[PDB]
Amino acid sequence: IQKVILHDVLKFLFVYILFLLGFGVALASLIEYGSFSDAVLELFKLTIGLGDLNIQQNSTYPILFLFLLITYVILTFVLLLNMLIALMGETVENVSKESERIWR
Amino acid sequence: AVLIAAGADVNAHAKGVFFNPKYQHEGFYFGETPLALAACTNQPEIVQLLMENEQTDITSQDSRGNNILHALVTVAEDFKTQNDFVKRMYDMILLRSGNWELETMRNNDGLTPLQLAAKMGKAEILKYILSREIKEKPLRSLSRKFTDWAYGPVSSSLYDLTNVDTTTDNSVLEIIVYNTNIDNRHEMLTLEPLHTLLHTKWKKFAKYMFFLSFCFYFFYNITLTLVSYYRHPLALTHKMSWLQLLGRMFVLIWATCISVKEGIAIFLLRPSDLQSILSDAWFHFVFFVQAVLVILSVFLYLFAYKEYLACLVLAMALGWANMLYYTRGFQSMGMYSVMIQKVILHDVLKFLFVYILFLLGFGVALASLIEYGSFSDAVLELFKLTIGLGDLNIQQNSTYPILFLFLLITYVILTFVLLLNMLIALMGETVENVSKESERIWRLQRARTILEFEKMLPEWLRSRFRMGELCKVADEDFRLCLRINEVKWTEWKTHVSFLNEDPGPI
Amino acid sequence: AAKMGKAEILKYILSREIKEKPLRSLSRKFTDWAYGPVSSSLYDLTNVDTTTDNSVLEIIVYNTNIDNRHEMLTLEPLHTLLHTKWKKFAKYMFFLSFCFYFFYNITLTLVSYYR
Amino acid sequence: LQRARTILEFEKMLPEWLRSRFRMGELCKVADEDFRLCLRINEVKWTEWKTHVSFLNEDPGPI
Ligand SMILES: CCCCCCCC/C=C/CCCCCCCC(=O)O[C@@H](COC(=O)CCCCCCCCCCCCCCC)COP(=O)([O-])OCC[N+](C)(C)C
Ligand SMILES: CCCCCCCC/C=C/CCCCCCCC(=O)O[C@@H](COC(=O)CCCCCCCCCCCCCCC)COP(=O)([O-])OCC[N+](C)(C)C
Ligand SMILES: CCCCCCCC/C=C/CCCCCCCC(=O)O[C@@H](COC(=O)CCCCCCCCCCCCCCC)COP(=O)([O-])OCC[N+](C)(C)C
Ligand SMILES: CCCCCCCC/C=C/CCCCCCCC(=O)O[C@@H](COC(=O)CCCCCCCCCCCCCCC)COP(=O)([O-])OCC[N+](C)(C)C
Ligand SMILES: CCCCCCCC/C=C\CCCCCCCC(=O)O[C@@H](COC(=O)CCCCCCCCCCCCCCC)COP(=O)([O-])OCC[N+](C)(C)C
Ligand SMILES: CCCCCCCC/C=C\CCCCCCCC(=O)O[C@@H](COC(=O)CCCCCCCCCCCCCCC)COP(=O)([O-])OCC[N+](C)(C)C
Ligand SMILES: CCCCCCCC/C=C\CCCCCCCC(=O)O[C@@H](COC(=O)CCCCCCCCCCCCCCC)COP(=O)([O-])OCC[N+](C)(C)C
Ligand SMILES: CCCCCCCC/C=C\CCCCCCCC(=O)O[C@@H](COC(=O)CCCCCCCCCCCCCCC)COP(=O)([O-])OCC[N+](C)(C)C
Ligand SMILES: CCCCOc1ccc(C(=O)CCN2CCCCC2)cc1
Ligand SMILES: CCCCOc1ccc(C(=O)CCN2CCCCC2)cc1
Numbered sequence: 001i002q003k004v005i006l007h008d009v010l011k012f013l014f015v016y017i018l019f020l021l022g023f024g025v026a027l028a029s030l031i032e033y034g035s036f037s038d039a040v041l042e043l044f045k046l047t048i049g050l051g052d053l054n055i056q057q058n059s060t061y062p063i064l065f066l067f068l069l070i071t072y073v074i075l076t077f078v079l080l081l082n083m084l085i086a087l088m089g090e091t092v093e094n095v096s097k098e099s100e101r102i103w104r
Numbered sequence: 105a106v107l108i109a110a111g112a113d114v115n116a117h118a119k120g121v122f123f124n125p126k127y128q129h130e131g132f133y134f135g136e137t138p139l140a141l142a143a144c145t146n147q148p149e150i151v152q153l154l155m156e157n158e159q160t161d162i163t164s165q166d167s168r169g170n171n172i173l174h175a176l177v178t179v180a181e182d183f184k185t186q187n188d189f190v191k192r193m194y195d196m197i198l199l200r201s202g203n204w205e206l207e208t209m210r211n212n213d214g215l216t217p218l219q220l221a222a223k224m225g226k227a228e229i230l231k232y233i234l235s236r237e238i239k240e241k242p243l244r245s246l247s248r249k250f251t252d253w254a255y256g257p258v259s260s261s262l263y264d265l266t267n268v269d270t271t272t273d274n275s276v277l278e279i280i281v282y283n284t285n286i287d288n289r290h291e292m293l294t295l296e297p298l299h300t301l302l303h304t305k306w307k308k309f310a311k312y313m314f315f316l317s318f319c320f321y322f323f324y325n326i327t328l329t330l331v332s333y334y335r336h337p338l339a340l341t342h343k344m345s346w347l348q349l350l351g352r353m354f355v356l357i358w359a360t361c362i363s364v365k366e367g368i369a370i371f372l373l374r375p376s377d378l379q380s381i382l383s384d385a386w387f388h389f390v391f392f393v394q395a396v397l398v399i400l401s402v403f404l405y406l407f408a409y410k411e412y413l414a415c416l417v418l419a420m421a422l423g424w425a426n427m428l429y430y431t432r433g434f435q436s437m438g439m440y441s442v443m444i445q446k447v448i449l450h451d452v453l454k455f456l457f458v459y460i461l462f463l464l465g466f467g468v469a470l471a472s473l474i475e476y477g478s479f480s481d482a483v484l485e486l487f488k489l490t491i492g493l494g495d496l497n498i499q500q501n502s503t504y505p506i507l508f509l510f511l512l513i514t515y516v517i518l519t520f521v522l523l524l525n526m527l528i529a530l531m532g533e534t535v536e537n538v539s540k541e542s543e544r545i546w547r548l549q550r551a552r553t554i555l556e557f558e559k560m561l562p563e564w565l566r567s568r569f570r571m572g573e574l575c576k577v578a579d580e581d582f583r584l585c586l587r588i589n590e591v592k593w594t595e596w597k598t599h600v601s602f603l604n605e606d607p608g609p610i
Numbered sequence: 611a612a613k614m615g616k617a618e619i620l621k622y623i624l625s626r627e628i629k630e631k632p633l634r635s636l637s638r639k640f641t642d643w644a645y646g647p648v649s650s651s652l653y654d655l656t657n658v659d660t661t662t663d664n665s666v667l668e669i670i671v672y673n674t675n676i677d678n679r680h681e682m683l684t685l686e687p688l689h690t691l692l693h694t695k696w697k698k699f700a701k702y703m704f705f706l707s708f709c710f711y712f713f714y715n716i717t718l719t720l721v722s723y724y725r
Numbered sequence: 726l727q728r729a730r731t732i733l734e735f736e737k738m739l740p741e742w743l744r745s746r747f748r749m750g751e752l753c754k755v756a757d758e759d760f761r762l763c764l765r766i767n768e769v770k771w772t773e774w775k776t777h778v779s780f781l782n783e784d785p786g787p788i
Binding site for chain 2: 011014015018019021022023025026028029035046049050051053063068073078079082083085086087089090
Binding site for chain 3: 726728730731736748753761770781
């Protein structure tokens with residue numbers, strides 16, 4: 001658990017906040033807002049798994065109000081999380097031969 | 105030997121088309137002399153027999169301008185094919201000559217044998233030339249590596265930096281970095297006078313110029329966000345003498361200084377290739393896009409054009425994507441961003457083409473039990489379902505109940521069990537192959553950074569940040585050298601070659 | 611040897627070079643010229659090309675019994691004989707078959723969507 | 726193995742006047758009155774140094 005938090009998880013968080021505060025303030029275009037508390041929260045609730053689509057219905061533009069919402073889902077799910085699993089597999093493979101001595 | 109001692113000419117020049125081919129399989133370029141042919145086909149006893157003759161002109165030039173030492177560089181290959189002999193023919197011919205006439209000669213491209221091995225990507229001839237130590241007594245000025253002192257298992261050497269540093273145009277360090285043709289550049293930047301010459305540039309000036317470039321681009325995106333969030337936003341055309349008026353000015357000035365600077369570097373750079381944009385000049389375009397969109401949004405507003413808010417959100421949302429560029433100052437975060445590139449190219453672009461084939465395949469063809477405006481709506485009810493939310497009023501208001509799952513189950517089996525789980529299975533294979541190369545392919549990125557900070561320095565400041573020391577390596581031979589220390593426990597010999605009897609730093 | 615899947619006897623026969631003087635017509639691989647480390651050879655295509663019925667290239671491809679077919683198609687006159695067919699005619703017939711089946715699904719969708 | 730079965734089915738649906746134009750091979754003279762239909766492949770080899778006795782042409786090159 002120690003080798004995964006140091007070598008893998010702390011680098012994931014810096015890249016994700018760069019998009020979460022990147023997209024988050026810059027969503028207040030088709031709906032404006034108090035954006036930094038709210039439009040950041042509507043992109044974090046969407047990442048947990050719940051979602052509220054009344055803001056897409058009450059948008060200035062319909063289906064075009066998916067391009068900043070699709071580009072968020074492509075990066076954070078396909079790209080960033082699946083590359084975390086690909087690096088934890090490399091990290092477990094190197095520490096499994098040393099974990100008996102570094103425990104003792 | 106019968107023919108030569110009967111009057112045969114030893115200075116012929118085969119000027120044919122077969123000996124000067126256009127393509128590799130149509131002929132054999134060897135150097136157009138009887139001495140280049142005996143050397144390039146591994147016949148060392150005829151090479152000695154031809155140089156002991158007195159009519160042999162060892163300093164002649166053929167149709168390309170090449171001489172005997174340019175010709176051996178051209179036919180040189182790896183260890184897996186030729187195995188030794190070009191490196192052993194190079195110094196047999198060099199030591200017999202006995203001076204710097206062959207090594208300092210320029211062909212019709214204007215290159216020496218040192219610069220031609222770097223232009224063509226020969227990493228085994230170049231390893232030989234840069235660290236060439238000749239320990240004999242009458243021929244020691246033909247060296248590029250000296251020994252300053254030694255005591256026990258402790259030595260101190262002196263490399264030579266005459267054409268391998270960036271004090272002259274078209275040098276060995278510059279050629280390797282800007283060379284888009286060859287593909288083993290990150291195995292030629294680990295060689296011994298070149299590895300330490302980039303490491304010293306980073307600690308003296310180039311890590312401080314890289315922090316100042318990061319602060320000013322960080323403040324450019326904060327100021328562009330705050331004046332656009334607290335609302336036309338920019339340039340404040342109605343003066344109320346407001347303090348912190350610089351924020352509307354600083355965004356406008358700095359967006360012109362990028363667009364001019366990237367207008368040049370796009371115009372000069374053209375290695376015309378699809379591999380060029382994906383590897384070197386991706387960020388030369390996408391800093392030029394943003395600097396246009398800030399300026400063009402101001403020019404739209406001044407007449408009536410009303411599209412002055414579309415560009416500003418594009419200029420802000422792109423302006424935060426670009427700041428992953430600045431991760432290459434740290435080894436930890438830099439190598440991580442390298443593997444983002446290899447995953448987007450090799451894994452993600454192929455996933456998207458197969459998924460849209462089902463998303464527009466199922467999507468229009470769902471309008472059967474519910475009809476619809478299907479292409480906007482029934483496509484959206486299959487993309488909302490993939491995000492994670494779902495709306496089941498259309499299944500209740502279907503023509504057929506539970507049968508309205510077969511096109512909805514066949515969608516979930518493919519996109520979750522099959523397609524996504526095979527993406528993870530391929531990223532594990534892709535990370536495993538690039539993890540051994542990511543340290544060198546990162547250093548090829550940072551080496552191009554250092555050599556562009558050096559060009560934007562005035563001449564009084566180039567002189568202060570400069571490596572090298574004038575040593576005395578022979579009788580009136582003063583060179584500009586670079587000292588590297590070493591500890592070696594395996595070869596025990598007595599020391600005869602040294603520039604100083606008394607060791608130590610002094 | 612191709613019907614039964616013997617990839618070591620078949621490697622021997624297809625590239626059989628006999629350099630002796632009285633028995634050289636028993637070869638299936640000749641040397642046209644050579645100069646230094648550069649040569650140019652000539653394979654033989656008498657029963658291994660598809661100009662006759664029941665040939666060596668046809669037998670290996672349509673052979674469902676054996677299981678090492680993809681190790682018999684990498685042998686030296688057969689690897690280059692398929693690569694040349696693809697560049698002359700077979701990559702252009704494969705694009706024309708893709709366009710017409712693409713237009714068949716677009717037209718079948720639009721006439722069924724706009725009822 | 727998938728693409729090789731594709732090529733050999735496109736070849737069957739060609740008329741006989743068009744088979745003749747797309748055809749590999751060249752009539753060589755490999756012995757006394759032995760004309761065969763051959764396929765030329767080039768090679769570069771740096772490891773075996775021998776002198777050449779077997780060759781159909783003294784004068785090399787494409788011609
Ligand atoms: C805040 C979110 C909640 C998370 C919990 C709070 C976290 C608080 C933690 C704070 C500091 C972390 C613990 C100490 C780390 C020291 C070095 C280390 O071990 O890292 C190693 C891995 O490489 C990395 O982890 C790179 C660090 C990522 C930089 C992003 C900023 C901080 C990340 C934090 C969060 C991102 C959020 C970004 C928001 C601004 C470096 O490799 P090494 O094995 O040490 O090799 C020697 C390197 N050396 C030669 C240079 C010495
Ligand atoms: C001695 C003190 C006085 C010396 C003054 C001499 C004058 C020297 C300078 C002269 C001119 C510099 C050119 C910049 C032009 C304006 C800004 C601009 O538009 O360019 C660019 C920024 O470029 C930078 O701002 C980098 C910082 C360079 C300044 C050097 C600091 C002083 C030199 C002393 C150093 C010693 C320090 C160590 C001391 C121990 C903007 O583009 P970018 O996107 O930000 O760049 C990314 C490139 N990319 C697009 C390819 C991705
Ligand atoms: C114009 C923006 C593109 C958007 C769609 C994509 C279209 C084309 C896509 C093609 C996919 C395959 C090619 C990917 C790029 C080349 C490889 C690469 O460098 O990967 C980089 C991707 O880094 C990023 O993700 C940021 C760059 C912009 C992408 C959009 C991010 C969110 C934008 C928000 C919305 C804005 C919407 C746009 C507004 C108009 C990572 O680079 P690196 O390895 O970490 O650093 C070293 C790189 N080097 C060695 C090359 C120097
Ligand atoms: C649009 C969705 C948003 C995504 C962002 C926008 C993306 C815009 C990007 C556009 C072009 C991509 C960047 C340049 C790639 C050049 C070659 C390359 O590096 O790929 C490599 C990986 O192999 C592949 O990636 C295969 C490509 C998939 C084909 C699907 C169509 C386009 C994919 C895009 C999206 C799918 C959607 C489909 C909708 C129609 C090929 O391997 P290689 O290492 O180069 O080896 C040399 C190969 N060679 C010998 C032939 C030279
Ligand atoms: C662990 C580290 C990361 C933590 C998670 C990040 C999220 C943390 C979540 C909340 C943090 C704050 C808690 C209270 C919530 C808001 C109140 C507030 O003061 O916000 C102020 C800033 O909001 C703005 O001014 C919007 C403009 C963007 C600010 C600059 C861009 C930042 C991007 C670069 C950042 C540099 C670092 C980037 C790192 C790569 C004002 O808010 P407001 O606009 O007036 O509306 C809300 C006010 N209300 C509630 C009263 C209605
Ligand atoms: C230049 C690059 C070429 C591509 C075109 C990209 C441009 C955009 C693409 C399609 C837009 C279609 C029309 C909208 C723009 C017209 C202006 C407008 O009035 O709309 C408004 C919204 O404007 C926006 O902010 C756009 C919506 C999302 C922001 C950008 C993401 C879309 C980029 C997708 C492709 C990226 C590139 C694809 C490859 C990565 C702005 O003005 P407003 O009406 O005052 O504000 C509405 C609120 N109010 C009415 C209540 C006040
Ligand atoms: C978005 C949220 C941002 C929040 C922060 C996120 C952080 C990260 C995210 C992104 C940032 C990633 C890169 C930026 C860091 C700088 C570049 C760098 O490599 O750092 C270097 C130091 O950097 C320094 O120079 C130390 C600072 C003190 C002196 C600098 C003051 C200006 C120059 C003064 C003169 C003024 C001009 C002349 C006037 C007389 C690293 O050095 P190190 O770490 O100590 O050791 C590592 C080993 N290494 C060196 C081989 C790597
Ligand atoms: C990045 C690339 C992929 C992008 C994502 C894909 C989805 C992009 C999402 C939206 C894209 C368009 C945006 C506007 C929304 C619809 C408006 C419109 O003009 O659509 C028209 C086409 O719709 C039809 O005519 C339905 C019949 C199917 C079309 C042909 C099959 C396509 C499959 C093969 C495709 C070849 C390529 C396949 C690649 C492997 C008419 O629409 P409508 O039927 O009248 O109802 C909607 C009209 N309304 C809103 C006014 C009510
Ligand atoms: C201010 C909030 C900072 C929290 O920063 C993170 C938020 C979410 C994540 C996630 O990874 C989302 C979890 N996600 C994982 C995969 C399946 C569904 C849930 C990571 C960092
Ligand atoms: C016009 C829309 C094009 C977007 O094209 C994609 C949509 C979704 C995905 C996904 O991969 C869904 C994300 N999914 C990942 C696993 C857990 C839950 C979220 C990929 C491409």
